[PDB]
């Protein structure tokens, strides 16, 4: 398929780890509108202190989804993790077989471009 001899194994490994690790997240809105994908979700904890005490302890959701199913995902559209809903804040470049979707909570803040 591709002149790699290695990316094929990479893609097979990615499919296997999607199957054995992670959950099914369905997307809402955007050009994809409603669609169901399999991805491994993680949510590391991050805290900022700002002034004297402004502990705003939060989370940094990532999904690590294959680029093929998330082509032209844009940023404004939202995402749902089963019962929970998110919105894609950024998309990493593909490493060869997939990338990472970094998510924020709630509703995206406006558009603010024109």
């Amino acid at each position: 398929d591709f002149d790699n001899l290695f990316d094929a194994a990479i893609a097979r490994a990615d499919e296997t780890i999607r199957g054995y690790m992670g959950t099914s997240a369905t997307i809402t809105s955007g050009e994809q509108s409603g669609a169901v994908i399999r991805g491994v979700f993680d949510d590391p904890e991050n805290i900022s202190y700002a002034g004297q005490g402004v502990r705003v302890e939060g989370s940094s959701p990532s999904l690590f989804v294959r680029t093929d199913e998330v082509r032209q995902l844009r940023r404004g559209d939202t995402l749902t993790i089963g019962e929970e809903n998110f919105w894609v804040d950024r998309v990493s470049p593909d490493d060869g077989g997939s990338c990472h979707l970094w998510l924020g909570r709630g509703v995206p803040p406006a558009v603010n471009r024109r």
């Binding site: 296997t16 780890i17 054995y20 690790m21 491994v40 993680d42």
Partner: protein, 67 residues
């Protein structure tokens, strides 16, 4: 619940034969792995389950002789 058991076991046998019995998976801090069986015992397990379930006959009785 024997036919789907047979199907799953046979598919596992075939993929293990070809290339697709994954043993370990790693996600940089989230890794697991499974134990592996043997080809011979998996084959005899397949044979046992198929003979005990209701699929078609696969083995006859001894062998007759005549001049």
């Amino acid at each position: 619940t024997r036919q789907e058991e047979l199907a799953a076991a046979r598919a596992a046998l075939h993929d293990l034969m070809t290339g697709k019995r994954v043993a370990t998976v790693q996600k940089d801090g989230r890794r697991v792995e499974f134990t592996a069986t043997s080809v011979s015992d998996l084959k005899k397990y397949i044979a046992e389950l198929e003979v005990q379930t209701g699929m078609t006959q696969r083995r006859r009785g001894p062998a007759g002789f005549y001049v």
